[PDB]
Amino acid sequence: AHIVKIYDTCIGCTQCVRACPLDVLEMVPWDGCKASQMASAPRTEDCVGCKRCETACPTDFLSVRVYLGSESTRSMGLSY
Amino acid sequence: DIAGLTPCSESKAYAKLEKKELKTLEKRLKQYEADSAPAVALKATMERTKARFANYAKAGLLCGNDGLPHLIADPGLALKYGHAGEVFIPTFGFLYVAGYIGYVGRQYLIAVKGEAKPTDKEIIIDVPLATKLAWQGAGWPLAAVQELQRGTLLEKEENITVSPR
Amino acid sequence: GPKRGSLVKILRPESYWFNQVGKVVSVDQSGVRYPVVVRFENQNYAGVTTNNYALDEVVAA
Amino acid sequence: MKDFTTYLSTAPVIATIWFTFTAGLLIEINRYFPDPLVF
Amino acid sequence: TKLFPKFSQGLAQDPTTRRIWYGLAMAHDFESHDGMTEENLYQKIFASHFGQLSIIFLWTSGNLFHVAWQGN
Amino acid sequence: AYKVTLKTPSGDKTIECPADTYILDAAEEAGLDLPYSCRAGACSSCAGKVAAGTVDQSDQSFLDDAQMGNGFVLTCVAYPTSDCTIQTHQEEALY
Amino acid sequence: WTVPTLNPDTPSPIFGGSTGGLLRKAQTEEFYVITWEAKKEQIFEMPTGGAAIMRQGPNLLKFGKKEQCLALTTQLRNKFKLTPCFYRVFPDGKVQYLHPADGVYPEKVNAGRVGANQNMRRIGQNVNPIKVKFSGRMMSPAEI
Amino acid sequence: KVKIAVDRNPVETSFEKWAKPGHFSRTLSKGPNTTTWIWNLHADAHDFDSHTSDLEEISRKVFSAHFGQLGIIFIWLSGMYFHGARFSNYEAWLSDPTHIKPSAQVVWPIVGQEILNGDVGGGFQGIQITSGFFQLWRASGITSELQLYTTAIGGLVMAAAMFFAGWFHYHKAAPKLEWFQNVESMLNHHLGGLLGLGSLAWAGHQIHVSLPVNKLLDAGVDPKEIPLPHDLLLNRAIMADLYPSFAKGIAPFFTLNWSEYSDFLTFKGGLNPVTGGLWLSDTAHHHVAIAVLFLVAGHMYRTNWGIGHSMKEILEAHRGPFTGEGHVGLYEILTTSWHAQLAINLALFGSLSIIVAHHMYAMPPYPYLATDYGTQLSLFTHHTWIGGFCIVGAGAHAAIFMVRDYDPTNNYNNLLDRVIRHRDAIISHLNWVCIFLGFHSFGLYIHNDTMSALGRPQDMFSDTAIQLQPVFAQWIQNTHFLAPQLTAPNALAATSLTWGGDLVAVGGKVAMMPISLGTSDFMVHHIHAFTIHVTVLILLKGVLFARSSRLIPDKANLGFRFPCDGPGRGGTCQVSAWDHVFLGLFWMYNSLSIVIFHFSWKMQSDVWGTVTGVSHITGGNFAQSANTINGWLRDFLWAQSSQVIQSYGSALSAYGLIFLGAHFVWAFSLMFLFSGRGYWQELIESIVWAHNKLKVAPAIQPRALSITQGRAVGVAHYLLGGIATTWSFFLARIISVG
Ligand code: CLA
Ligand SMILES: CC1=C(C/C=C(\C)CCC[C@H](C)CCC[C@H](C)CCCC(C)C)C(=O)c2ccccc2C1=O
Ligand code: SF4
Ligand code: SF4
Ligand code: FES
């Protein structure tokens, strides 16, 4: 299972959540940023590490960072 | 002479291969008229060959068993035996023109970095400023050594670094 | 902190414009951990030319 | 006309013409002064 | 799963042959093997060297035997 | 400068905004507190809706042509190019 | 709002049947089913390839992987503004008709959503891997 | 209602945008910040679909583009004629086409390129052209270089006209979409007029100009001795002298007594033996037949009157039971996607050019052409390459369409739809068959060489060993050999000697002979087949899964060209139909290189040489060396390598020069082929540190190429090096040995 992490620079513009094709992300209340919104990954075991989140985070260092881990059938995106 | 290298102004293989060249020439030549453009061209070619060879012999080139010119690389040796005209002056002219071009390049570069449209001057060029810096670029070495004595050439320790340095 | 439009040198190591200078667009007066808003002229490998910063990560230069 | 002048001040055409100029310089050089080896 | 690479169950848990491939690829990166301790790893490389030497001596002795057998 | 009539949840507030200043920046300099987060044209936090007049938001990246054709604007990267009227706090109406 | 259930007796939309269909994995491990009610009857495209026509109201389709249904949700939600609800099913017959199942949709902040996996810090504040050394497995510094 | 629909002064004329890079596109118009800006700017300059969305404006753009293309071609042909008129020995070679080498390019007396102005005969000093302009012009009967002068002049004029045409039709008056869409009108127009008229006018020129002058040529009269063509047109006296049918003029034609005109419409078949060219009577008969055909053809479809046909109607009519909607809606499709018509025409045209080269070497039409073995080989390889590239471009633009213009909503259950359905089974069967082909056809040669090195040639597959005789091809050959007896009673000779028969000799050189087919040729044919099947495989996969896949269900969303979708779920490297056609380029080059090798060797061994018996160039060695790859490499390559590897000091020395240079560049491509743009940008960052260290950074941010762009650069350089190496080798070898 890959690893994904959120950092305080999250401006909550959700593009990550907007980019995850697997809904491995979501937005929650927060108070660190003006958006009062923090990105959140409750379904990491579904992330195939396609990182489109990382592509989407406009944050200087990506408010979010993916780390590929072990391999499950869902991690590999196998439908067979 | 040096390293047992005899001058081809003295060497035998030199004149040998020269004559061989001229022989091949006359051989290709013997298949025409005289006034024929090919004929006259081959004759001019023979002329050029012999002239280049006389020049090479006059140059005092050490040319070994092949009779072919080999060059020497030592300031002291070339000076002591009259062989600076092969490496020394060529290298000096090269370095002159090269430093000239690099210096004027940096000159235009600084001039245009002192602009509000760096990209646009990088694409479209200031013709007259270019010509001006070209005319002025001769004094590039004196200018550079001046700026060195002032230490104004190089950038200080503020350029971007990598995180692990 | 610094003034809007003013020029500051960036010191945040992980920043594209690290060891470089930027222009303070503004600074927030709320409790944001990074109130300094600083534009840039060259774009990053992401193409962005402006980033948020705390007060220390920059210096008026 | 000014549009034309700008089009000529565009970059690749300038690179072009400068290169053409230099190359013709050196070709004529070799024409009138064939076979250079030393000096 | 399979005892695939006992020294790395994480690899032993791949339901593809890549399990096999990486179990090979990492058979000797003990610094990454599971639960490895320092002195243990030291003795590991010790026996590794031992087998290395044994390999060399076998090579040489076989050469010499075969030449003595079938050479001129 | 251009007169920007901001139609806000507090009422209308007409501010002056130079041609070289982003709508959001001018609003803040005038003491208003409009929504924002990224300030880079890459989200919807600062969305408004232009009712009349024109803006230049050419560096924005988040909106599509149909959204802009209906007047939506990312105020953090939008310059006025005429006197204009802009309803603020429009993010919800974009969704 | 409350978690819905699944109704296996839903008229599936109109499609001629493709070859990009389900496999052993469906009968073996699991497979997902998607639930949505269309306002009208209309043709649409199959994520696994093919043109299909949805029926008015209750329409149902099943798939193995999650990304199929997710892309399909994107297509309908952005092209027809439907709010489908798709589940997770296993050969046991147990459903979990869950893939964005969470009251509303995650693209908006919502009360109750507790943050997870969120390093309440910067990213540059991580420690050198020399310290994660001699752990029970390969562990990244950012793991902590 | 078909008519003319145009728009006046649509586009203005100013050098304003000329000063504006990227103006055509949205983003590029913003100007460069990093270096890829220029690259993409160039890349998208002619993507008019990317430019905008107006079908009509895009049509006008491509219309003017074609205009300019034609103008370029005019320029080139005219310059060719110009240099033929001014720097050639064509009149000398007219006096003697048997011992003067066609040469039209002379170089300048400079540092040493002058040595290349070798001796080609007639006191001429230049370079032997392998184009065959000489035989072309002789067949057309051009005599005075003044004629070529006039020709080049008129070509200049034509090019200027075409370019003005493009300008006018783009900026002054640009037609309208419906006008562009009056498709049946365009078909009738072209089909009848263009082809029929061109062929018929060529036949008239033939009859009244070339056949008389070429007749006198083969009669042996001096070239500068024949009367002028227009003088011939004036004096029907001499035309009746040559053929008395002309004494009666044209009234016999108006009395349907064609039999009398047989003097110039023959059906001999075969070549003129004293010339090696086809029988010009037969050529004119061919062309007039083609003319009548296309003329009657051009009146098929309705345009503005009740009679005609409807493409749409007939296509809808044609539907079968197993097929559902049959051929419905395709009318709509073709009326709408430029890339569709494009890819169609490209595939067709590549196939054509291939067939062209085939028949051309099969039955050479030009005077003494067959003797010019080099010209034969050269034009053949040329057109083969051109055709293959046209094929792959077809595949490219087809996939392009399928990405861009595709829409399911209009194609419900059509041929396309069921294809999309059962594509998996299709491609599966294709994989299996290609694998079988490769296995068998390759292992044949390999087992041969294996038994060879094993000293068991008894167990090889040779025409002497275990045989595979193409009984089919040989039976068909004899079939064509015997056809004229009954299946063609009015025939005199078979169209080709390779059907069987005798040998034709012009000047000792082997002009043409019947060719047999051995197990070697069996094997090489099967090789070719397997390779082509691989190529069609990769192309078909690319096009079928361009929009989606069980791996990527949304592939249509990533644009046509795109690097990958990450390393996630294993790694998405090289997953575009763009990448697929890339691979196809590779496999195609492989295929055609093999084919030209086969052609060259078999020619040299069993066809070409000099008559006395046949002094075959390689003495038919191919027959027994081709079964084994060792024989291949040594006896073909290693042997014929001498010419190129000792060509130095000769006028042909440049052949070995470019040989080594092509080696060089072909290897140069491989750094791209293997490297990584990430690594590259890392190096970029290092070097920009180095520069800024001296305040010498460039404004435009230096950037490593896109993955795609690196792929493209590499593949271009690779194919360039390979083709050039082979080209040089062939040229030197044949100029030396032929
Ligand atoms: C790139 C390195 C290099 C090398 C390998 C050589 C090689 C040589 N040099 Mg030196 N030399 C060089 C660069 C070099 N030089 C440069 C750049 C200069 C310009 C200042 C000189 C100036 C120079 C002179 C004026 C003389 C030599 C001489 C020689 C030759 C014998 C002395 C010796 O071994 O010097 C070893 C080389 C070096 C120590 C490299 C550094 C050179 C410094 C700057 C000057 C060296 C002068 C040398 C010690 C003089 C020895 C004279 C000898 C009769 C005792 C020998 C072929 C002598 C000669 O011609 O002998 C036949 C001689 O008279 N060189
Ligand atoms: C070498 C290499 C590079 C580095 C090389 C690059 C980016 C090409 C550089 C092209 C030229 C040399 C730079 C542009 C020069 C400007 C026009 C400045 C003016 C120069 C004058 C001489 C005209 C890659 O970026 C790359 C990326 C992906 C796969 C393979 C490779 C690859 O092999
Ligand atoms: S790694 Fe892939 S699945 Fe995970 S958030 Fe990023 S894009 Fe979505
Ligand atoms: S990762 Fe970036 S895009 Fe996603 S919520 Fe955080 S700041 Fe917004
Ligand atoms: S605050 Fe994100 S686009 Fe304006």
Side-chain angles (χ1 to χ4, degrees), chain A residues 1 12 19 21 29 32 35 39 41-42 49 56 58 69 77, chain B residues 3-4 7 13 15 34 37-39 41 44 51 54 57 59-60 64 67 69 73 75-76 78 82 84-85 90 93 98-99 102 105 111 114 116 118 128 130 134 137-139 141 143-144 151 164, chain C residues 1-2 5 13 22 31 35 46-47 54 60-61, chain D residues 11-12 15 23-24 34 36, chain E residues 5 10 12 15 23 25 27 35 47 51 62 68 71, chain F residues 1 9 11 18-19 26-27 30-31 35 40-42 47-48 51-53 66 69 71 78 80 93, chain G residues 4 8 11 13 16-17 20-21 26 38 47 49-52 57-58 64 71 84 91 93 100-101 103 106 111-112 115-116 124 129 136 141-142, chain H residues 5 10 19 21-22 31-32 43 45 65 68 71 79 84-85 92 97 102 104 109 112 118 121-123 126 132 139 141 152 154-155 159-161 165-166 173-175 192-193 196 198 201 203-204 212 219-220 223 227 229 237 240 244 247 249 251-252 269-270 273 276-277 284 289 291 297-298 306 308 317 320-321 324 326 329 340 343 347 350 357 362 364-365 367 370 374 387-388 393-396 398-399 408 425 438 443 453 455 457 465 470 473 483-484 488-489 491 493-494 500-501 505 507-508 511 514 518 529 542 546 553 556 559 563 566-568 570-571 577 584 609 613 619-620 623 626 631 638-639 649 651 654 656 661-662 667 676 678 690 697-699 702 704 710 712 714 716 721-722 724 732 738:
Chain H
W638 178 255

